[model samples]
Target: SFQGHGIYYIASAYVANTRLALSESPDVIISSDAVDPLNNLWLIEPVGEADTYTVRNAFAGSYMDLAGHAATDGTAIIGYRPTGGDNQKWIISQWKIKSKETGTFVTLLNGTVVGWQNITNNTSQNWTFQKLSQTGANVHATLLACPALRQDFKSYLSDGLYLVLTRDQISSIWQASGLGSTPWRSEIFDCDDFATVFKGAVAKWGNENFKANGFALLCGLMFGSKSSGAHAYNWFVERGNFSTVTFFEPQNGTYSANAWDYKAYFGLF
Candidate 1:
């Protein structure tokens, strides 16, 4: 499963370690101490002897070599031209990588350093490789999750406390005084407060069952900022249908059918 993909070494608490890269000056290998793509590459090949294989770097295509072919403890490893020597052969049994020449396993030191040490079968030697696709997706997914804004307006709307209004009636109310203020308009409030006020007004004018219907908190860049500055607003969706969605600029108390044209990072119901 890990044959063709790039190898990402994850250490304690799922953090990527940089010790997998090769040095250019002395042509030696050392710990990178950072989770970067430059140090994340490895080409694995099976030697056809059980779980034995050879690990090569995808960046320079150099084989992981044991220094001087020595099998003793603490033998330094580096990236060098493949010689097909026994020192280059390794066994990948379970999660442990054992060198065929020295019988010692590749162990991680201090969460960043990589070296060949005596087999201890401890968590310090425990390392896992993440696929290139999986790593990329995980990073992008985290970035996307940060901009989302969620708030619950259901509890604020009580049953039988407010009257239900038609869609046109709601639009008329927004056109009258929906745009109340801006984040810069006062020191005590911001865009979120605008959205909350608009939602409360809609609930008050609409029927008691309006809270049970679908609605979303819309967020994106404001109009003047050209998709750069953060902004907040509200969307009233008629039963989750896109065509029935009406956008409301809460800060300004304006309504627009095409107001959702901005780049929407997240929507919360």
Candidate 2:
């Protein structure tokens, strides 16, 4: 019953708040310093038992599992398929994700390897789960079939996936975001400027649209998409018939798509 069930950024307190991420190479769980939240995102769900849950990599759709369900110290932890084994079940207690069989907490060892360590009440063994808010998201959820920056946006978002809005609808949401028709200009406004205001607008929209006080951490790109250099913009997940990242250039209301072009995410800021 300690689960706060949602998409979370699971970070280790001992390693300068490094996140437990599912790596693309070799497809294993590792301590990551990557900027993409998609890499670090995890979806935690109940396992039909009190204090027992399954931690799934949100982006990879894999389960964070004990290497072999062995209780030995420093056992390797990897993200694998769910198989109803106890090794896949984790007990989240006091912000610590401990293995059901080993009774050891998930730990960061050898600098970047995510493994389990015998409980010693150590800081490195403690975990912090930063849950994300899913407000103003799409209701129907999209099924991406065409080539996308990332495929399977539907499976990733599933329920409350994202919103597919008309240009006017995107307009409404953008204005509602408080970014307004303000041109993207320097001195008047800079790159960091819009990010702060827009992120604040996220806080504002979440407060108005959702009773819950939560914000979506976001990221994007504009190198050649807009001008000579990278620029600031906001993105909302588009779902239903088409699921992908929809980029909004608040400066003039230019819209961009294809989620893959999105790079660098600012965490819960």
Candidate 3:
């Protein structure tokens, strides 16, 4: 689809993209009999390796041989010639995904098979390539899988299991759990930069009142002030003082009345 080719009716009403029309632009020309002669199919040979053999209308050769075979209008297969040039270098095409487990062969622009006689998608049906340095020897060419989707959920499954989710499911999962705050910390605001600001404010307030019990409201102010923006936060309660504190964005607005504590709320509990 990205290359802009035509569509065709394969069997019944099955419409498929045309990848092998003689007129279609090709990255590299293949040998219709490179794999098997009776089948009349082409095997993708490396570019600049097409060469002319001793036969009528046999203009196929190494990439260097086929570069200028058709002069002027680009439709004539003539004499045998080898011009060593980079323009004659043939570029192999990208293959489509067959399966992730066994990445044997890739689907072509056209629906045809690369090597074997059958044009169906299968393992043995795929073809390999040869290097100019090691001509006449077949080398296995690995196909690439499709690009992976971006991760959208923070999963914490026990120990074993594949991470799988539908597009809609990923959105729903992330929507329920609010984002982590600060891009630096999780929910505990009592550490590093956040803790510095919190303790500093408390020290300023304590310098004036100097009330141990009054520290309760000061700590609460610490939680209230730092728990802003899109990130989730945490809060803790100790014997008379809270220890661990985490906070999430209020479900609806800035008021505690709009907050939803799926885990646990300290003072209220």
Best by lDDT: 2
Ranking by TM-score: 2, 1, 3
Q: How many clashing pairs in candidate 2?
A: 5
Candidate 2 has its poorest 10 consecutive residues by lDDT at 149-158
The local lDDT score (0 to 100) that residue 203 gets in candidate 1 is 48
List where candidate 2 sits over 4 angstroms from the true fold: 1-3, 25-34, 114-117, 135-269
Task: Give per-residue lDDT, candidate 3, residue 20.
Answer: 22
* TM-score-superior candidate, 2 or 3: 2
Give per-residue CA lDDT, model 1, range 1-269, as digits (tens).
33322343433222344346555512334445543433335555668788787776654557777777776666566777778887788777566667788776666554333456654555655556544322223323322433222221111222211112234555655665445533445535676666666666654543332222222122222221124465566654332232243556876656676554544444432
Relative to the true structure, how large is the alpha-carbon lDDT of every model? 0.49, 0.56, 0.23
State every prediction's TM-score relative to the real structure.
Answer: 0.41, 0.51, 0.16
Q: Give a tens-digit lDDT track for model 3, residues 1-269.
A: 11111111111111222222121122222333223211111122233333311111111222212223322222222122334433333232332212111222222323332211223543322333211111111000100010111122121111111111122322232243332233444445423344334323333433432211111111221112113322232221211211222222322212232223222211110
By summed lDDT, the worst window of 10 consecutive residues in model 3 runs over 135-144
**What are the per-residue Cα lDDT tens digits for candidate 2 across 110-131?**
6654456655766777777765
Residue 170 CA displacement from its true place in model 2, Å: 11
